[PDB]
Design a protein around this ligand. Structure first.
Ligand SMILES: OC[C@H]1O[C@H](O[C@@H]2[C@@H](O)[C@@H](O[C@@H]3[C@@H](O)[C@@H](O)O[C@H](CO)[C@H]3O)O[C@H](CO)[C@H]2O)[C@H](O)[C@@H](O)[C@@H]1O
Ligand SMILES: OC[C@H]1O[C@H](O[C@@H]2[C@@H](O)[C@@H](O[C@@H]3[C@@H](O)[C@@H](O)O[C@H](CO)[C@H]3O)O[C@H](CO)[C@H]2O)[C@H](O)[C@@H](O)[C@@H]1O
Ligand SMILES: [Ca+2]
Length: 562
């Protein structure tokens, strides 16, 4: 009931509703582990010819996405059956998975694709997409099976199913110049610009190369596809880390991109390039119903305002999904789905290194973000008057479900401003995790620093006016809520409120006031108010750190069972 409303249905392979003659992993929360990195922290291991997982369709489907893990540096197949009749072969491959690092060098996570001595493999799961020539009814038994000739072994994590409409044709051949076998995207855009009666271009079903950053200028431009399953923009797969996509300047304010998919060719993170859409001051641009993969980001906006991001799918990128800096204001990020982003899936960063003030007035609504391969599902870094509402986040590999931080990351930065940053209506399932190193740390349980479902981090910038309300935190890895001040700046927390929050079976505490994260770090400064904040069945205590935090005040307004 919370998050994005998407046309596809996700079914976990390990659900005991599904018959299998293979191996269900028992869950853990461990990076670089096939259960830890899986959706729902488990998957079904198919290991020998004839092993299968049998799903039952709850909704008709003609298209299927298998999130899976196969061996490093292999491509192959796994079989799919409909009611016991074999119907195709998924094309599975570890070409975009397996990024290498070390427990002590987790800052390199996402950047290094080559195996080497002493390196652990992370980011183990990738996706295979398959469309079948039949719409199958609900109640169909869809069997994922390892036949002779299929890959040696495979971890089956989940299957999304979708009933995909037929491809939409050119809305009007007189108003949209058509990409074709003889006409490239670039050429169609030239003809559009040069003929004032055209509203833009139509990209039809098929696979179209994008080896370029396509700049949209001149006037508001409409870029329309036949559907994400049918219109595929394809970065050249023979190459790697090719910066392609769209750049939308202010000349093309009011432009539209919709109903297509873009398949990148990145195999590791690169900082600078790699965004599918570049927003430099763009305004009133609508990005709608696109499906992006294997880019660094879907979108990175710079001082772009009044834009709409609606119904998109962001899967398997190497850094953020959607992020915005430099006074990017009054944008609507509504009804988007993210899975397997390589950094925070949905974020707002008030960086001012390009002459912009606060990110203000933005709305991040009906969002779903799972399997965050690094950092948080939702991250808010400074800003003012920004709303995060009706969110579902789950299975972060390393970090909180929600990060609220005034840390500059080394840039010219504004902290939180005069109006509340609000987080209203969130469900976070199995969020938090392990990252960085915990040398000299208090409350030390392992090699790493441990992160609660929600992290309130005072950095080197002001941290104030934060309202967290109507949040359900189910089985966090460690804590529900975690308050932490960076030393030595010791920025004081004012006007933090937590209302109607349930923390269900946190393994350690429901509330952790960080006392010494690291050598050189001290307790948190400021305070926070608590109303109807319920901690149910903690592992150790309901709240940790109160007595050791003399510079932090806990205001128990009412309703608190701790
Ligand atoms: O305005 C800051 C710069 O943004 C771009 O750089 C990004 C990098 O800084 C980095 O961003 C981090 C990001 O992933 C996020 O989750 O956490 C931090 C704060 O929210 C960010 O610092 O990596 C991103 C992906 O490669 C970069 O997009 C611009 O390219 C750069 O010119 C700006 O200076
Ligand atoms: O995955 C989180 C981000 O990683 C990178 O940014 C780093 C900062 O988050 C930060 O990390 C600190 C870490 O070194 C250790 O000291 O713990 C601190 C808190 O307990 C962390 O805040 O600082 C580093 C230097 O600026 C950054 O390397 C990526 O740049 C960013 O994209 C990620 O979102
Ligand atoms: Ca699973």
């Amino acid at each position: 009931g919370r998050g994005a409303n998407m046309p596809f249905t996700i079914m976990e392979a390990e659900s005991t509703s599904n018959a299998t003659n293979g191996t269900k992993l028992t869950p853990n929360f461990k990076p670089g582990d096939y259960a830890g990195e899986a959706s729902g922290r488990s998957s079904v291991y198919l290991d020998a010819t004839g092993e299968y997982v049998e799903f039952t369709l709850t909704s008709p489907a003609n298209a299927f996405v298998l999130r899976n893990a196969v061996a490093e540096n292999t491509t192959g197949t796994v079989s799919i059956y409909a009611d016991g009749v074999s119907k195709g072969k998924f094309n599975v491959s570890s070409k975009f998975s397996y990024l290498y690092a070390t427990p002590s060098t987790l800052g390199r996570l996402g950047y290094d694709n080559a195996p080497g001595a002493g390196l652990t493999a992370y980011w183990l799961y990738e996706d295979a997409q398959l469309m079948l020539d039949q719409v199958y009814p609900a109640g169909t038994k869809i069997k994922i099976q390892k036949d002779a000739g299929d890959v040696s072994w495979i971890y089956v994590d989940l299957l999304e199913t979708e009933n995909v409409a037929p491809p939409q044709a050119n809305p009007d051949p007189t108003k949209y110049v058509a990409v074709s076998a003889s006409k490239s995207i670039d050429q169609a855009l030239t003809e559009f610009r040069q003929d004032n009666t055209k509203k833009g271009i139509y990209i039809p079903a098929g696979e179209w190369t994008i080896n370029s950053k396509i700049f949209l200028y001149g006037r508001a431009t409409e870029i329309v596809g036949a559907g994400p399953w049918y219109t595929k923009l394809v970065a050249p797969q023979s190459q790697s880390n090719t910066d392609v996509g769209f750049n939308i300047s202010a000349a093309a304010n009011g432009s539209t991109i919709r109903d297509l998919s873009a398949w990148g060719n990145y195999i590791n993170r690169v900082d600078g390039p790699g965004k599918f859409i570049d927003g430099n001051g763009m305004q009133n641009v609508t990005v709608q119903n696109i499906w992006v993969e294997h880019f660094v980001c879907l979108y990175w906006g710079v001082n772009s305002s009044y834009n709409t991001f609606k119904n998109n799918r962001i899967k398997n990128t190497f850094a953020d999904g959607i992020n915005m800096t430099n006074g990017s204001s009054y944008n609507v990020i509504d009804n988007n789905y993210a899975r397997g982003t390589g950094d925070a899936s949905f974020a707002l960063f008030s960086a001012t290194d390009s002459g912009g003030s606060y990110n203000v007035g933005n709305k991040y609504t009906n969002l779903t973000a799972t399997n965050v391969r690094r950092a948080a599902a939702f991250a808010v870094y400074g800003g003012s008057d920004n709303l995060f509402q009706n969110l579902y986040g789950a299975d972060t590999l390393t970090y909180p479900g929600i990060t609220i931080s005034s840390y500059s990351f080394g840039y010219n930065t504004l902290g939180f401003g005069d109006q509340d940053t609000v987080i209203d209506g969130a469900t976070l399932d199995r969020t938090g995790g392990d990252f960085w190193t915990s040398v000299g740390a208090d409350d030390k349980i392992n090699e790493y620093q441990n992160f609660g479902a929600i992290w309130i981090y005072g950095g080197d910038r002001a941290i104030k006016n934060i309202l967290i309300k109507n949040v359900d935190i189910n089985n966090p890895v460690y804590f529900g809520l975690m308050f932490q001040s960076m030393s030595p700046n010791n920025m004081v927390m004012q006007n933090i409120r937590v209302e109607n929050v349930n923390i269900n079976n946190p393994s350690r505490y429901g509330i952790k006031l960080v006392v010494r994260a690291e050598q050189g770090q001290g307790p948190a400064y400021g305070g926070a108010s608590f109303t109807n904040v319920k901690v149910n069945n903690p592992g150790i205590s309901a709240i940790y750190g109160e007595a050791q935090s003399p510079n932090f005040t806990v205001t128990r307004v009412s309703g608190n069972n701790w």
